[PDB]
Amino acid sequence: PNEECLQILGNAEKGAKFLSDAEIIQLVNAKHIPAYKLETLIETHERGVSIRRQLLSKKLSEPSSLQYLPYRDYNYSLVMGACCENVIGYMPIPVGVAGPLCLDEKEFQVPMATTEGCLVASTNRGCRAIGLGGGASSRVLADGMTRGPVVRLPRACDSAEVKAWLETSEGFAVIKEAFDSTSRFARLQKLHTSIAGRNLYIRFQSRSGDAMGMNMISKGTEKALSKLHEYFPEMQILAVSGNYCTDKKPAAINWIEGRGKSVVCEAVIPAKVVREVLKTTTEAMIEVNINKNLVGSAMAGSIGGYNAHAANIVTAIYIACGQDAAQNVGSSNCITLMEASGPTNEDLYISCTMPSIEIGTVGGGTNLLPQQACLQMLGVQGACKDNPGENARQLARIVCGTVMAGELSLMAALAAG
Amino acid sequence: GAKFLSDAEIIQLVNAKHILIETHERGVSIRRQLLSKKLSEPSSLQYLPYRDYNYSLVMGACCENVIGYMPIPVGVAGPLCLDEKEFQVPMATTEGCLVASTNRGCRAIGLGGGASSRVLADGMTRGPVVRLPRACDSAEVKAWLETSEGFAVIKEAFDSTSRFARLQKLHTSIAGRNLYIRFQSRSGDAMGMNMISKGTEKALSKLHEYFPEMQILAVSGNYCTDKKPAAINWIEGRGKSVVCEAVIPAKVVREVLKTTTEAMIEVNINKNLVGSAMAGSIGGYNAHAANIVTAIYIACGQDAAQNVGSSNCITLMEASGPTNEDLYISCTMPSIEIGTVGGGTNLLPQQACLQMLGVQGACKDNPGENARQLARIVCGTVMAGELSLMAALAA
Amino acid sequence: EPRPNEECLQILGNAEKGAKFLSDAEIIQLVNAKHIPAYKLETLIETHERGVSIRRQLLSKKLSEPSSLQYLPYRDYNYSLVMGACCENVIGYMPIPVGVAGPLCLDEKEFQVPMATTEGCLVASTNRGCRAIGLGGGASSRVLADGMTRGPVVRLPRACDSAEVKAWLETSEGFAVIKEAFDSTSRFARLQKLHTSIAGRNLYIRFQSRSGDAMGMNMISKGTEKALSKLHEYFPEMQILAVSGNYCTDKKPAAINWIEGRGKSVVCEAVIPAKVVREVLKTTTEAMIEVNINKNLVGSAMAGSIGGYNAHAANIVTAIYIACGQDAAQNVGSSNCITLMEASGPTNEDLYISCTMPSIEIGTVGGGTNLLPQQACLQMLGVQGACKDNPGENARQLARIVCGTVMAGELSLMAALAAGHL
């Protein structure tokens, strides 16, 4: 009944919990109730998902499309008004595990969410060679998420004035105070700027504790630019990101300046281990690395893509561990080097250098519990109380270390043919 | 067999190195318990779900040492009015507001009479590196591959390996005695990596016959280029090269997008062109194409690591209409790497999202048309994403 | 002494008098107060040199230090081949010292390579590279590709229309019509496969063709214009926005030139005996390879280079280009080079070296190669002017010489850096 059902919705202590599935759907189709009124009216999250699927399904060319998209018994409360909207369900990505990865005297079992055949198996083989080689070592070389707004002044002489002002000790200090006032972990490092006529691109860089820090840095960037407006009232803020960050697009600035964590990792693989585990020789590995990862990438016109498949490992760890998998674009930046080592140049020195690993252990997908499980496997879930940023640094080191395992195994598979 | 043993006992054997199980879901349980013994926090696994998932479609083709699955929330943006049709576009993401913003982009496009798209090129690639004794020899091979007779014999060998192996023009570059060879072929509705690899191996094997001193150094010399940033994918395309466009009436930019045509053009020029230029970008002349590509790719069983190149996009915005107040927007994405059969599209949840869009599996009438359609959907939804985010930045 | 402007104009407009019957003071007087603007001085003054002399006197009064031009030479230079062709508002010439590096043993021949440069030691260093190559049996090179390009941008009303034009150009019959219009413009105009790129309703079209021994810019542009006119017959709503849309790409760095080639794409190589690397180059093979990998490959990669995987190819390209009447601004793309070094031979102690240069933009007819001094340098190499019995051979040979001299230069400088002064 259409007019009885409205009575049960309007009563403040009854609610739509008393109504049925088809009755709420009869209301919308008759146009008694608009569609957008169902988000706010319906009580529980899972029933909101159910009714959206049903409404959505009748509009589809094949109304049975959603049959095998699962949606029941998922914690939508951590996702609603925080991570996803118009939610009709969830997508299971198989999670495999590669390890142990022997990195800086610890051992890691690395979760990898992927649907590419053999990626975990191959990565795990690279892990095996590293462990039988005495483990890999890594260092975090730099740390600071960025945002890169574009501002505009009337003339290029003015934009130049502002650049010189931001380069002074006094002007930087003023901007630093306004940026840092927005948050606990927001500490502004040296500003990088570029002029293009009357445009001025300003790359704000700051650590962000254990968060990846896109939201924190943005908040700092806006207050900092508000303070900059007080010194330069004619300055227009065109966009809070003018693509100079650069976020989720290939850019040499991230390659050269770094973004998020800049990391290096390295290991030596005995000749014996290269033969028995990797089914090739040190000399063959080197020849392939030089001519694939340097020369080949060079011929193809690569900026920052001097590696075999860093992106595969970055992406799978990112999906498993609640990262922004779109940031695989810049986070997969990697140069993989290989050279002969040891008494008779028969052992394999390998290193991966990844200048822009954009990563966090708090916020975003890491609020969700399956994603926290994977972060917990690695011992890096959430914030680190004693050493703010140490969980995010550790995960970045794991990523780089795991990328190196991936590089060893794939580069060996290609070398053996 | 194993059904009479217990979980605690079978692990006893694998630990002792004296060592399959009769049910897929139990194989996952026992793997979780083996892994569990190696972690400092074994209870970390308890909220990583694993039950009642169809592991049969995974075991052999997709993933090894599987211990569960990672649920990614799926949202829907649409209807996206694209080429006289309506699509409800699934987007798997954990990024706040990404679906809502994309959906707004869709709303603006529909009220502007919808978007139009064309597939400009189509062919996955693979770019092996080979070596000859001398640069004079590598050059002889290049010359030979550029003749009609040479290309035809390399084509016959490539094409013999499978149904959809149909070799297009070759692209080669020499680096001294190295020769990089870029094979491009369509691949039915599959993304086509395995297919083009098999075609490449038999083609390189046939090239070895003409040049026995040639060394096949690696079936991928990074000249493809797969999953790394490369100008070659931007200039030559890879997979589907696609263009999409729409005109958004002035009032619609005002009321829906909360800005103006003029302000939008000013941000696009100075962010997506000039800004990306100052940043030293090749192919990243867009706001956030990667957000949409990645979200759709995870939802639709694509290889999410191919967002590196699939996200390549130039977003252009011009003034339009008689009064010059309407917003012409286009997105050009020359390297969308995509398929509707194989990989993660073999799993039922991922197929649900492909079925939403009406592109699931092979198009039996016209091989490749579902993958082509999906690329067009990706490019149209990227343009929707560009519209909304650029409006939010300009406002 | 100078008589009034009125009388000076009557003598100027008389056929049997002209400018020969006036003073320097009097020509300068007419210019200072219009009647003669300044650029018309070339087509009015008795001789080329007096036109240059007068232009200098005009300029000198405008300067802060009037005697600035004292040591800028101008007398007795053959300005006839310059005027209307190479340069306007000419006040003189700039002497660039020319040294010789050689013999360069390339493809079983010997070359004495002229290099116009002011950088100390460049010719000496390059010359040592030639010697190391000579003692190692010499270099070999092949020309891989040959075609100068021009990359106009056109526009259709919509992206779907530009898509239609791309597909039409990709059909055999569409390209054959465009090729016919292109090729009708000159005897050397032969259009190769078209490269096309869409950016919304924009459509960049890369026209490529050999061009005899000319570098070919003017010829290609002419071919391009007739090709687009014909294209407009089929697609009347097409607008030519610019005859170059930076898609060629000329005189700017661009991945397309690196990947597709432009002008002449060349490869060169040589094996240097271990003995020679030690004695001549003061280093070892092992050391050279380590420096090359970690400087020219890894270092160039960390700096974010496209096409710059070399030590100083640009030094050599520029010196040969100025010496040989080339367009030195084309150093931008023509310097593209990847230098590779590896172990070779029985001992694995000999140095294999190769230099691959995909975009050497060059020619032996036209532009600066019309002037006799730069023809002298071209004649040194045996590549001056057009080749009658094999059109394009001289420009191809010059491209090979450039790539081989670059390799010579790479060998030497890389050995200097590898030794570290020692």
Add this chain to the structure above:
Amino acid sequence: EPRPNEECLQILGNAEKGAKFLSDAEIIQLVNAKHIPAYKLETLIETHERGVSIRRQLLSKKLSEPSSLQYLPYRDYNYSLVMGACCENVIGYMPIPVGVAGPLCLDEKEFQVPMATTEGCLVASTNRGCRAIGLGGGASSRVLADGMTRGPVVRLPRACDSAEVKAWLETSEGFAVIKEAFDSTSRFARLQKLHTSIAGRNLYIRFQSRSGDAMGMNMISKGTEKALSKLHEYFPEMQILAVSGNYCTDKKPAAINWIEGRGKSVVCEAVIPAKVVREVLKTTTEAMIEVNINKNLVGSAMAGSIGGYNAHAANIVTAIYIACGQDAAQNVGSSNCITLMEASGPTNEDLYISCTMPSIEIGTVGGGTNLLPQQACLQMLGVQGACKDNPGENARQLARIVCGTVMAGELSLMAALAAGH
């Protein structure tokens, strides 16, 4: 009259005679008989021009056409400033025509810009661009950054050690010890913040400093060599692999030069009224923006350019570089330019134009600027040699003049592309 070889040698080794007492034919007879190496002619022959003359006679006999050097001039040129400084094995000089575009109205001054080129209409076209700027009220420019660089590669035993070295150079005291070493080598050496990059056990170190009015390669390199010697005292396992590891980056295309700058980073701007755009440039502001956006931004984007967002900056950079005694091979990076074009005024009919050139590598002291003809062109612009009272001002002014003349070039070519035919 030509004497036997043994007789000619005693004359050559007689200290109160020498080669001055031999004829050309005798000196050649000695070279051909392998008594004198051909390269030692420079230090044996008393006059520089005679050394050039004999090198030419020797060279001509090696050529397939012996008269090929006829129209290569060599006489009455001042080889004294070139020998052992600018060029070796010298057989003459190459005259490049010099034209003048101007006046360039820049920062309330006027410049007559010399351009050594052989490309037809380049000077005339650039000169049209100058007219538009001057009738548009002039151009204004700013040097934004100043510092030549050198980017050596060193190697440590492990990547962990390269990381240790990077962190050490990033502390204020580690940097200060390196800065003290670097600054000690020359009066203008002032080491700026160190930019470093790791690749495994490689460490690339980008040393940047002002260099007076010199372009500064040799100076920066000398400071770099001494700075690395100091760093070796703290890290004795460090290997200096190469004083240039291509991270500078000198004379190759590189994003690092685009993003960080190198030498002089400059920006230039003008507003061109519609009337001037009409009469001088023969077009409209609307047409020029449409061409600039779709050629210099979008076109360069599709071509995969880094730093090549301009029409023909390189033409102007190269022409001025040759005239003014610069290193013309550095036009690779010095030509880096993004040209921007906007509508201004009430009906979008005035043309705001700017050129941004982040890496103008230039000098007015040293190299080819030591030669008198090259100094004449520097003197034309008022930038010859070192500025005593304001060190670096001449080099800074020249880089502004390049950027401003580049903008002039951009205006004219783009206008011509916007019209047709």
